[model samples]
Target: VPRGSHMPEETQTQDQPMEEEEVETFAFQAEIAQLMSLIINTFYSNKEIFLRELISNSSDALDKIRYESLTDPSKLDSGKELHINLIPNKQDRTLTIVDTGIGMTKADLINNLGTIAASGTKAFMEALQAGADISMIGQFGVGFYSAYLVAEKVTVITKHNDDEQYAWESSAGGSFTVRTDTGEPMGRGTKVILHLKEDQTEYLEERRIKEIVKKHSQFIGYPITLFVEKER
Candidate 1:
C-alpha cells in the first residue's frame, strides 16, 4: 500500500477496449443463450405466464418512477401518464408492450437488460441443471426471457429522463445490440415489441389478452390498457 506498490495479480484483470459505435454490439454474458433456450423451450410450460411476467416487470418500472417522484418530484417530469399499453398488431404480427415508467439509461440497459442474467441466470442454470428443481424463474430472474416463449425477436426502445433514448434488441441470440434510437422526443419510458412467432398469433387477439390479464394481473396496481380495435 505504498507508493507505486501494486497488487500485481489485480493487473491481470486489465483489458476493456473501448468499442462504442453508432450501433453498439454488446455480447450476452455466459450461458445467456442456453438460459434463454431453456426458458423458451424447456422450463415454461404455460406460455401465458409470459404476459403476466411482462406486466409485472412494467408494474415494477412504474413503481420505481413513482418512488423517485416521491422524493424528487422532477423525476416525474412533465410528461405522459404512468400506464402500460399492450398493442397487438395483426398486420405486423407484433405484440408491443409499452410503459410510461422508469426507462433505462445506457448503463441500466447493459446492467439490467443487456446482459440481464449477469448473475442470476448463471446461478439459475447451475441450480436447475443440478436437479435442484427449485422454482427460481422469477426468483432468480429470467422474466425477460419469457418474451421468447411467444416471439422470435424482442426489441426494446427505452428513454431514461436523464439520458438519451436507445434501442436494445435480440432474438434470444448470443448477443444484443444497443443503438441510438428515435422515439417520442422528451419522452422517458420503455417499450418492448415482440415480433410474435407464427403459431403464437392467438396472443394477437384482444379477447385472449384480456382474459389472460384479467385472470392473472387484474390485481396489479398499475393500469394496463390493451388496445381495442373494435367493441366486439
Candidate 2:
C-alpha cells in the first residue's frame, strides 16, 4: 500500500487532472520481478486465465461505477449501455477487452497496476507457502497481473469522470509509463489491449474467445459481448 511513496509527489494528488501528454515513466520498487515470474511462468501454463482475469476486472470496474451512482447519478455516465466488449484483431494479433466501467486516473494507473497489484501477488505467494494451490482470484487481488499470462505487452486506456483520459503502457519491465489520450471519444471506461506472443494466437479466434467467455463469465452481472468484424 505504501508504493504510492515511489511516485513523484506532484502526481499523487487527486485534485488535478493530468496536464501533459508527454510520456512519463515510473519504476516499481521490486515486487514487479516477483509478480512477473509468478504470473508469466508460474501461471504460464494456464492461458484460459487471461480472459477470465480480464473479464473479472471489467466486472469489478462496472460494479464500482454502479455503486457510485447510488449517490452521484452522473456516475451512470454511459446511459445504461453497461457492458464488456471482447475484441480480437487477427491482423494485429492483439486481443482487447473494453468495458464501460468506473475508469482510473493517472495515479490509479500507477498505483493499481504497479504497487497494489504486486502487493497481492506477494501475499498470494504467502498463501502458497502456507499450503495453498488455490484461492479465488478476487480473494488474492492479483487479477490484473494475470494478463501477463499471455500478453507480451499490455496497454491500458482508461477514462474516468473525475480525471483526464490516459493510456498506461508496460512490458513487464517492472516499470510503466502513462501518456494522455483524448484522441478517441471514449466515455468512462477502460480498454486493455494485449499484444499476444507469437505462439499464443489461439486467443485471437472468435469461437475460442466466445467459448471461454461463456464458460467462465456466463453468470456475470454485466453483458459480455464479442465484437465481430466479419459478416454473419
Candidate 3:
C-alpha cells in the first residue's frame, strides 16, 4: 500500500548481550520524532480518543489476519477467537489492551511503531507550521502515538507468524527499545500495555473504558471485551 512516498533514510542497529539474550535497539527518524511530540501535545485536549484509536487499530489487525486466513487457514495456528480485551489494573495504574489479531514481528515493531513511513507526514508538519488545526490521530501514520497522550511509558508485546514473541517499549520519547521476551509466548496477536499518567487514571475505570468504547468503537467488527472486577 503506497499511501505516500517518503522513505526512511537512516537506521542503526545495535545488539547488547543481556545474560544470554540479545537485545536490539533502533532509532526513530527525525521526522517521526517531531511528529510524535506534536501528536502527544496536540491530542491532549481529547485524551480519551486514544482508546478509540487503539481499538480501531486492533480491529484492523484482526481483520488483516482474517483476510489472510481465507487464503491460509494455518494463519490461526493457536486459536480462532478474534477478540479484544481491555484489562485495567488499579494497583499498577496500568491499562492493557490485548487483541488476538495479527501480531507484529521485530521488524514490524521498528517499522510500524517507531516511525512514520509515509510522505503524508511531511504534509502534517507543513500543516502544523501553517497554523492549521491538524488531527494527528487519523492522518498519516501517527495514530499509535495517541497512547502517549495518557501514558508515561508504553510497552507492546506481540507474536507474529514471521517471528517469535518480542517486547517493544518507549516513553514516547525520541527512542525505543526492542528485545525478545523470555516469558510465556503470546500465541498470536498483540498486547499493548499503557502505564497511565497520574492525571489520566480515569482510564482505569471499567465504566469509563466501556463508555469510550461504546461511543467511539461500537462499530468495530470484532468483539471488544473490557474486564471488570466481580462484585463481592
Q: Highest lDDT: give the candidate number.
A: 3
> Which digits, one per residue and each the tens of the lDDT, describe model 1 over residues 82-116?
88999998989999998888889988888787565
lDDT digits (tens) for residues 1-232 of candidate 2 = 4554465775676765744566888876476667666666553344676688888888889888778989998655556588999899988989999999888998898787775534466777667556564424456767676778788899999998889889998887678889888577577899999999888899989888888887777766988888877955
Query: What TM-score number comes out for model 1?
Result: 0.81
Better of 2 and 3 by lDDT: 3
In the predicted model 3, the residue pairs found to clash are none
What TM-score does candidate 3 reach?
Answer: 0.83
Q: Residues 42-154, candidate 3, lDDT per residue (tens digit)?
A: 64456788888889889999999879978898876755699999999888999999998989998889888875466677787777677754445466566777788788899
Model 1: lDDT of residue 13: 79
Local accuracy by lDDT, each model: 0.80, 0.79, 0.81
How do the candidates rank by lDDT, highest first?
3, 1, 2
Score residue 183 of candidate 2 by CA lDDT: 71
Point to the candidate with the largest TM-score: 3
Looking at model 2, residue 227 earns an lDDT score of 82
Q: Model 2, poorest ten-residue lDDT window?
A: 129-138
Residue 170 miss distance in model 1 (angstroms): 0.5
Better of 1 and 2 by TM-score: 2
Rank all candidate structures by their TM-score, best first, as comma-separated numbers.
Answer: 3, 2, 1
